[PDB]
Amino acid sequence: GCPRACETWCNAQMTCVGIAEHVCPELC
Numbered sequence: 001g002c003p004r005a006c007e008t009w010c011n012a013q014m015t016c017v018g019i020a021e022h023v024c025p026e027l028c
Contacts, residue, residue, distance in 0.1 A: 002028030 009018030016024050
């Protein structure tokens with residue numbers, strides 16, 4: 001699914017808490 005750190009540090013409401021926010025908002 002959504003990038004590496006995103007599944008463990010980000011919610012589907014585009015609510016990334018960790019560094020996942022660096023890549024996830026673009027892929028998720």
